[PDB]
Ligand binder design. Structure first.
Ligand SMILES: [Cl-]
Ligand SMILES: [Cl-]
Lengths: 590, 590
């Protein structure tokens, strides 16, 4: 009887390795398209297999695509080297989202679903073209099913585990499928994600022949000179949970999914032609119950193809128009709804394209701002003259829509995503609800001591830029999140504070490599126990109020039941930095 | 408030090109595993790329994998040559199921969903290994999304269109996803299918290294000497519709889906190890509400791996045992439930494996018989001694289970399917309900005149073996199905009968190539109009009762509204032979 909260998020896109960087770039009107391939293939001969190919040499690229923390997931160098980098970045980003939402694997319900969009097997082609004989790891390393299932394996969850391949709309359909299963009760929480990586020539060449790649490698969405798109890399995941449940548990909500629909184009004239009447039917379906005067922004699919862009925008107009009419509202809108597309910034990330859209909107919601569209100085002549939709070409404050009586809705927005095979999805998002109005144990951990210093360092840094700006987390909330929002790993750090410069000071000294002065250090090595167990000594150490002893016990491996301590109603989760995954290189073997 | 009917079906498996042949072979205890590759690659050099590889050289193969009617779907030889044979056989088999269920595309609701399981891109590897430069058709011809979307494009439907990749369980999950969407109202009818074709070395070699292929290439499921499995080709589709709606419309029901569940293994010890406690949880989930004393047969996943088989069977025991207990029934079963696996006949068809299971069961239901399991003379020592489940090693009549009072349930059965990544689905099927207790227009059509003679011929043949056995269709029902269950194509035949030797005689003379004597001939060539239109002349020709004139008008292209004629309550659909697709060869280009 309620909607689905987005409670955690992560992404890597051209130029940005985290969502905070991404948003910064969108806001500045940064164009992040670069050259293809770059140093990607320079190790072997495949480098000029690329140079000989026909297509326009551009892409939005992720830096460090060959990098992966294989020890984190306990993998052979060999198992990792034959593993599609798409699976590798999926793992890391999914983990990142989990942490950002404040979820250690053991906090997840056992029926957590996993729906991850993915389209290409570029790497597997790359292996073959390099002469790499088959191994048992190759099959595992390259089946799309494994992308999803390996995640469910890593997290020990038992909800449905599916790759989604609807081409260019895969990740939006993911989000939709996850929402279905949450609304239906099959899942209590779910992970929806998408990934796309450009690791071979095959699709580049083919798309070019199709006449779909623009000669200057830009997605000039809405422009008059739109003439194709440019492929991009990207990876994203979001953690999902029923809104009501998420409010009681004090999760940090990014946004709410109010509506959501998918459909297929049917016979559209050609296999890969856009179908406006289907795109309309879709939106009306997702906007069922929602007031269209209530939508403030639409993140359009917006490939920047000369045909696709006006079709989409006319279909959108046609749909909101149909919607207004149904409820007795006047034929034309009260004011122009804003319109845009992240593809002008980062290009067309295909399987990851949908969620790039979603995250842009959620970020815009956070900062109550709409970023500029790019290459869009001269608008397209086939966009509607009727003034129903405005393209945002100018960084503006995002003011809320407002009712007839004058009531203001929460910020709302639509996102579209259309596969080149005719599979379409559309999501309607809403801004998160306003959250309503003692010594603590600080607990860190990583795999290596090196990674522990790393975690502590980045925590120090984040914590004080959040005081030089006053956005400091509440202490018990910070401690709460480090306790339950993090997997307790092999190497452990722990200590006890009463204030937060107590925190910041203790971190600065550990990083600088001092011998302990009131902090503790511990270790171990070698399923997921979601059961609540607590060591007999810890149980009565807590009885006394000797926090520090608990902390030091926890470091040499004493099981603790952290959620037992806090008022089960009170605590709220906090967005801290994610794990500093090692930058080990795993590429094609020799 | 009801279950989902299976209203149409088709399949191609090792040795059998239709379901009637399939069943025949299962009943006889035929082992259809052959050698790999065969003449498949003999055209080029890839033939001894295979010979040099390591794996045991066996597979269940489909004959005529390079064959396809590309003109039927209006395709370039070039577009078809770069098109994954998996997409090609999908198209043809989906079409076959549609016809078998008595559905022309125009009889489908516009929100028909399409969920098709598929795992490998073997062909795309084959193209690259042959040196085939990329084309725009390659990308389209090999993306998994296209497999599904091209079908929605061909049928002009707008429900969700998805490939499903959960590895070895893909097609069972398909069936499950389609059922979800029917039960939820998103779809009014849906198509679930699966396909698997062995067109490259890559997966063969890899699986072998994994130690999963048996040295003698047989799935010796339940045997004591089970030591691996053998890969198989296969393609299947089923048409789905809400039971109630299907009864009012008098569709020919294959079976009912009573329950259905999917889940994932989570952490099972290794990525590809079976997880009994998950397999149990799954079954209990799907069997929710169903009485386990009510199940007569289980088509087990049954790979014939030494470990997997007992695990599955113990998990099954553990589950039914848990079920019985919940309702106050005695600890042990009233009588042993039968157990089996089509994999002993046809091997392990991977993505198509699930539906092979389903269709076997539906066929067994039709004929009220259970076929023998194979290579199973000496049972596995880790199967339960408790007598809960019996392996059928002997062709037996399938007698119904029966209540305590003595009431007999309809025949019921369970089917399992477990992906090697940990994604599991389980379906519970139930036998179809017992169907309760004038001149007609006979109408045929094909693309070519050659294909028309073909259709007429096979119709003659089927119709009289169905009288030499007395299984003749009712005439108006036969005519009804040819009218509305068939796409009206380019070349047309029509005539009017009062009896069925009138039918059989008129077909015999047309086939033999006589000049017409009371039959008509017509043609045309060059979206799907689900609208009911009817030419002004036809409208009043019907007013008169001049059937023949309608028939002859319909041949030169006069639109007819056939469902307007019949009592909209009365008519029932009939299983006739499907379209005789041309056997044109489309393989790797030079
Ligand atoms: Cl812990
Ligand atoms: Cl017609």
């Amino acid at each position: 009887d309620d909607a689905v909260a987005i409670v955690g998020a992560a992404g890597r896109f051209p130029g940005a390795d985290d969502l905070d960087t991404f948003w910064q770039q969108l806001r500045a009107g940064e164009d992040l398209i670069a050259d293809y391939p770059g140093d990607r293939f320079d190790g072997g001969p495949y480098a000029e297999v690329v140079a000989r190919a026909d297509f326009p040499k551009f892409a939005g690229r992720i830096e460090g695509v060959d990098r992966f923390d294989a020890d984190f997931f306990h993998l052979s160098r060999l198992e990792a080297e034959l593993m599609d980098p798409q699976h590798r970045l999926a793992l890391e980003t999914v983990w990142a989202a989990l942490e950002n939402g404040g979820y250690a694997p053991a906090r997840l319900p056992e029926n957590t679903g996993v729906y991850f969009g993915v389209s290409g097997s570029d790497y597997h082609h790359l292996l073959n073209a390099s002469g790499v004989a088959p191994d048992g790891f190759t099959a595992t390393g390259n089946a799309h099913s494994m992308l999803a299932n390996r995640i469910s394996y890593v997290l020990d969850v038992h909800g449905p585990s599916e790759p989604v391949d609807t081409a260019c709309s895969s990740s939006l359909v993911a989000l939709h499928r996850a929402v279905e299963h949450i609304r239906s009760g099959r899942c209590e929480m779910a992970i929806a994600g998408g990934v796309n990586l450009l690791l071979s020539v095959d699709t580049f060449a083919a798309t070019h022949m199709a006449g779909m790649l623009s000669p200057d490698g830009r997605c000039k969405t809405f422009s008059a000179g739109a003439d194709g798109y440019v492929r991009s890399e990207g990876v994203a995941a979001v953690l999902l949970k029923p809104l009501a449940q998420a409010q009681r548990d004090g999760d940090a909500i990014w946004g709410v999914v109010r509506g959501s629909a998918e459909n297929h184009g049917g016979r559209a004239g050609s296999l890969t032609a856009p179908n406006g009447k289907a795109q309309a039917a879709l939106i009306q379906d997702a906007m069922r119950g929602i007031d269209p005067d209530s939508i403030g922004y639409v993140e359009a699919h917006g490939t920047g193809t000369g045909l696709g862009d006006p079709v989409e925008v006319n279909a959108l107009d046609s749909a909101y128009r149909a919607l207004r009419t149904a409820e007795g509202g006047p034929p034309h809108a009260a004011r122009p709804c804003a319109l845009g597309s992240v593809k002008t910034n980062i290009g067309h990330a295909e399987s990851a394209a949908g969620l790039a859209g979603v995250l842009k909107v959620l970020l815009a919601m956070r900062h109550r701002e709409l970023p500029p569209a790019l290459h869009c100085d001269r608008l397209n002549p086939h966009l509607p003259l009727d003034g129903g939709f405005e393209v945002v070409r100018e960084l503006r404050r995002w003011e809320p829509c407002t009712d007839a009586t004058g009531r203001p809705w929460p910020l709302r927005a639509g996102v579209s995503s259309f596969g080149f095979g005719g599979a379409n999805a559309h999501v309607v998002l809403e801004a998160p609800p306003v959250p309503p109005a003692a010594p603590q144990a600080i607990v860190l951990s990583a795999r290596d001591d090196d990674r522990l210093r790393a975690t502590a360092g980045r925590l120090r840094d984040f914590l004080d830029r959040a005081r030089r700006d006053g956005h400091a987390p509440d202490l018990a909330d910070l401690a709460f999140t480090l306790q339950v929002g993090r997997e307790a790993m092999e190497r452990r750090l722990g200590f006890v504070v009463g204030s937060m410069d107590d925190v910041l000071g203790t971190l600065d000294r550990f990083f600088a490599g001092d011998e302990p002065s009131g902090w503790h250090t511990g270790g171990i090595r070698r399923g997921v126990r979601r059961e609540a167990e607590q060591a007999p000594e810890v149980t009565r150490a807590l009885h006394d109020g000797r926090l520090d002893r608990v902390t030091a016990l926890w470091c040499d491996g004493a099981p603790v039941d952290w959620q037992a301590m806090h008022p089960t109603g009170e605590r709220r989760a906090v967005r801290l930095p994610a794990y500093p995954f090692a930058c080990d290189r795993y590429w094609v073997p020799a």
